[PDB]
Amino acid sequence: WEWNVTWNTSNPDFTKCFQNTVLVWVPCSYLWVCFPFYFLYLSHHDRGYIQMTHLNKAKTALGFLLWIVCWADLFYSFWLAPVFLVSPTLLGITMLLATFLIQIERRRGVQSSGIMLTFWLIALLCALAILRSKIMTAVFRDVTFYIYFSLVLIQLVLSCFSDRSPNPCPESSASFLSRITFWWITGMMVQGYRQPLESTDLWSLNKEDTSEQVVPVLVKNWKKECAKSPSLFKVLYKTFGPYFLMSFLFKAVHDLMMFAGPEILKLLINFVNDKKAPEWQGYFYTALLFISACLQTLVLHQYFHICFVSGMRIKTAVIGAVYRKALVITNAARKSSTVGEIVNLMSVDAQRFMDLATYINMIWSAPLQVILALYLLWLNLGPSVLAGVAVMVLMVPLNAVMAMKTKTYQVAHMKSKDNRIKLMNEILNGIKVLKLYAWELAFKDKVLAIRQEELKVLKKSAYLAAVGTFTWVCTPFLVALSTFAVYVTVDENNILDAQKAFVSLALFNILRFPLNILPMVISSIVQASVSLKRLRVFLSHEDLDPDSIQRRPINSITVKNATFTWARNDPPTLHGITFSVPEGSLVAVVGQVGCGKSSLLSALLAEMDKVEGHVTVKGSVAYVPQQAWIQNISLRENILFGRQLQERYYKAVVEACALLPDLEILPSGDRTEIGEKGVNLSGGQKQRVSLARAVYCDSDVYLLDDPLSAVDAHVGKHIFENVIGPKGLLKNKTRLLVTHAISYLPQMDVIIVMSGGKISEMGSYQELLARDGAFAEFLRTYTGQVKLSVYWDYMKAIGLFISFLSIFLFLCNHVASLVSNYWLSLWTDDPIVNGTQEHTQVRLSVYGALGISQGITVFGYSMAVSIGGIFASRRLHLDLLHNVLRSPISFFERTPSGNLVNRFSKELDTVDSMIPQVIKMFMGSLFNVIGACIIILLATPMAAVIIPPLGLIYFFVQRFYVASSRQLKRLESVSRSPVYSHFNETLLGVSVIRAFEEQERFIRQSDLKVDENQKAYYPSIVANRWLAVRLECVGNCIVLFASLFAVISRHSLSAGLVGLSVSYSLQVTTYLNWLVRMSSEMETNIVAVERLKEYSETEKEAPWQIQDMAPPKDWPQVGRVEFRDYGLRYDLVLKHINVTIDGGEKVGIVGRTGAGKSSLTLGLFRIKESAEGEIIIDDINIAKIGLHDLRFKITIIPQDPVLFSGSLRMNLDPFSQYSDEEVWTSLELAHLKGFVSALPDKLNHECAEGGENLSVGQRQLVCLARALLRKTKILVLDEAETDDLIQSTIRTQFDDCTVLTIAHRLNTIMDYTRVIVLDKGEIQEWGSPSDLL
């Protein structure tokens, strides 16, 4: 090895000894170090054995022949040089290891072998180098090498094809090349462009990615850890750590390869410096740069794939284990953890684990990258690098402090947003009463105040985000300027050549990311630490005793000397209970409140903690809980409960529970979506469903914990007759019922009466009555791409001046960056005379000036984008609120309240906290690309020939990525919510699930939902990897072309220009993809703006204030109402209405369901526009008057009074227009002075959502107080205990005012003269009740 023939000569030939030693030791050596390690994977991971195919044999036969040929050399050598013995033997032996390896790979079922392929690629390159040398030298030993090379080439070609296998995910069947360069998802991207993607188009999860695979492994490892009485981290890295080990390896390789880049750039700069260097050296350097960049791309995205897959495995396993634990944990643990905390364990903790696994390897990669970059910068610049290190040491803690303060601001913003969302939910749930009361402006002002607090904290967060963008963008320049200034100023002979400038710039750009992610990674580790503590606490919770009850398959229920607890430390709730319930007997638990009736049924289900005794419940148990648990599935599936539908049995169960009227009122019948999310049901209906579900399940033992609490007396008696009674559906079933109603007690076979959780003289009804003891005492007790129009809409919401100022500032920022780097290039070209550079302080001053301009302009554009985002969020929230409050009631009835809430929640978030940062990221990911391309084209104009082709590539790739990514993302977005929702359901009805033994069915359902979520999430991240690989190699193909054109025209190019072009190309690589990912984020984020502005063109209500035809104060002077040919369409509910209500004349409206009674009040308040009608109050038409005016001059007491959160005074007078004396007088006149004076907060009593603290009677009297305080001449009443009080109060002082009354009860309407009867909208009778009869 000497430099004359290998590097100095125009023919780069390797020496003969080098050829025969190192070029042969490289490939053989690769297989020798990998072979042992590869058994780990081959053994731990198995997939069967592949059959005998021609391909596998072809490879094995060529491996045999190749070994022979290599040993044939040893034979000829045996037939002087020491290398002519060891090298052929070694090659033969490693070849024998290669053929054995494909053999064992066949045995272990691997279709594509990364090792064999790479190994053959390295062998091929080594053979190619020797081949070229041997063909340039020119029989004896050469022909053996030609045979070796041809066989190696054919072996390499064979190794690319995938062998036979031993809507699935194509990742498995994918070849090694298809796996490293993600190609099995190309079909998904093309399909997503051509057709919309649905959940039916998504591939089935990998068998190792499925919940049924990952969750049991974690559960087993947790069981092992808990048996060794517990570290959840130990379990986590014992279960997923093995798989994550490869990411660590890939992470290291990427770090080394990414530092190779600046070294090769240094070599290229040195090559351009000397004009006597052979050109092949420059082509070798650019090939090395291209190869290292492409390798770094591959290993990096393989590392990312491993990290993301491991994060999935962790999230799925954690979710499954949490679900199973919740299915097994005891009542004390559930009481400790509430409900939202457990769902938080299922959502935020598992998501934190996944997001952490994405970047946790940085906790070591970032320090190692920093150390390596600092050492290379030292090698370049001496001790002058300490200035840049000092700048970094200043900036990184600054970034951490700003991140902590941003977290504080986000906590405050979340609190204020939750307040706003609560207020908006109460506004939407009660918008009818708001519009009827003309209260839209007051609640608008309330929401605006909450949003003002939210916008203040958002503005502070925006200031912080702008400073953070400034620091992140301008820290590389600060480091470069500090190190360059110190370098040139400490020593006059410190020459700043291109080698010491642009290589150092590349090193600073390498340093930029790790420094910025290290604080974030440490914060993520701390958050994952607290989340891991929460998960470990939940998974260490006490498990319920499964055998607490004997659960004997088919004296039916046996309890002897059994005492139960609700907690180990807590005293017993049921002391010394004994009773035997025979098969097919009706037993009623009897007691007072807090006696221990429900505790008995909980104890029979192994929900109580049994401190002593023996319970032997025989056969299946159907539990009807006191608090009805309703699944969000349809009512039919609620009753079925995952059971085969039997039409006769179902249709016998539904009416026996008297569920037929409930089915009739509900829109879709039994297919209606009952539950919290769907249609809400009354308590009695929920008890009916629960009882119907229990009856359909057809158990032998029934535990009915007060099934008839909320059903009415007639409905309850009917239910008992057809279901629970001896002549009902459950005649032969053992029914244990908890009741406090005597009506059905004589029909009960056995009455278990207890007191204070103790058995107290149980027996039959007649015998217990005869005994005259405790029972007698008890009885005596009583699509396409988002349009540019919405981008322009967001730009206008920001403000055209702010948006265009930010665009100008960003353009100035990158112009300054480009000019600063060009100035550095000119600086590096400064000649050396007398050992120094003449122009240093001028160059340094201009570099610093350009950097200061860049910094102030970066701060400027970050400020402009951040502030414009605040402005846009304010404008969009105001417009959305105004449009919502102006839209008619029909709009709220039509549109589900879910999407209306999803406009003020999430969508505002996307607009205010996400869109500005995505805009900032896109601007950079775009102008970094533009500046790099401009620099490359200006330095090497010929590089314009590769801009079109690669650009075309970019186009197509971007297209497919975008056209699929959003779809995948939206699929992911629709899959995450059900899982937690399901968990919530499982947390609410865990007692029901345990009693019905449906734990496995719900575990499978949770596995399904998670698997659907992961089936949406996996294609998304693999899409990210696909886009990256393609466009990063595209950017790396440019790096190649930029360096190649630099070496082609090196004689007319300076070293500074070459270094500049190559450095800028090195980074355009890390951005062409981020440019697309950010374009996709823009497309998927601007839709939020589109959904915010969608109620802007819908039909709105008539103007609230006309101000041209406004009425005079006291417009209803007497309140003379006249319906002149009124017609209202909800075809016409109201028709031919010609009635006249005189001023101060009491008038009521009677009619059956389906008449226009209520719709008539909607006519008075103009809720629905008059299809044909001229309602006139006194001498003024209603339709001409603005809405607010009439809504203020007419008052209405609706069916269910809606009390809004806040003080009582804000309920009575939201505008605070009426004085305190008027409020006090009205409250006293409303029979409420005694109660209202009782609250410690006086008039400022904080009533919760809907006035839950207040009683129904009180809320009704508060609504009456509102109407009384209004002091208007026209009042409407909507009637459904306190009825005597509200009726007397409406009859007390409102005799002066004209009162319309719609009552479903004839008793009250009889008092009012002039009754109007509505048959089907027509006026059936118009006269006084005396003329009625």
Ligand SMILES: CC[C@]1(O)C[C@@H]2CN(CCc3c([nH]c4ccccc34)[C@@](C(=O)OC)(c3cc4c(cc3OC)N(C=O)[C@H]3[C@@](O)(C(=O)OC)[C@H](OC(C)=O)[C@]5(CC)C=CCN6CC[C@]43[C@@H]65)C2)C1
């Ligand atoms: C409110 C502060 C905030 O939270 C910080 C910051 C940005 N957040 C929004 C959240 C977010 C981040 N990534 C995302 C990718 C897609 C969608 C959202 C995000 C990011 C993150 O990873 O969070 C975990 C992040 C971003 C960049 C970043 C380092 C960084 O995390 C340490 N880089 C600086 O170090 C920039 C970058 O150019 C770089 O590193 O250049 C050397 C980076 O490109 C590469 C090759 O990585 C990237 C990535 C999108 C590409 C385009 C240009 N832009 C500029 C910023 C940068 C980014 C968190 C907001």
Ligand SMILES: CC[C@]1(O)C[C@@H]2CN(CCc3c([nH]c4ccccc34)[C@@](C(=O)OC)(c3cc4c(cc3OC)N(C=O)[C@H]3[C@@](O)(C(=O)OC)[C@H](OC(C)=O)[C@]5(CC)C=CCN6CC[C@]43[C@@H]65)C2)C1
């Ligand atoms: C694959 C799709 C996508 O890439 C995922 C997801 C969103 N992306 C858009 C890219 C993006 C992200 N951040 C940004 C910040 C500015 C500009 C762009 C982005 C984010 C990211 O940082 O990527 C690296 C991200 C976002 C949120 C997120 C977790 C998350 O990534 C870990 N949340 C969970 O923590 C949400 C959040 O509300 C929350 O805490 O919810 C309980 C979160 O609030 C906090 C305190 O963090 C935040 C952050 C801005 C606040 C406002 C409301 N929104 C809702 C989503 C959330 C975010 C990437 C699209």
Ligand SMILES: N[C@@H](CCC(=O)N[C@@H](CS)C(=O)NCC(=O)O)C(=O)O
């Ligand atoms: N050079 C960086 C590259 C990491 C990188 O690409 N940056 C972020 C993006 S901010 C990332 O990890 N991307 C993951 C993704 O594709 O979501 C390293 O040291 O790994």
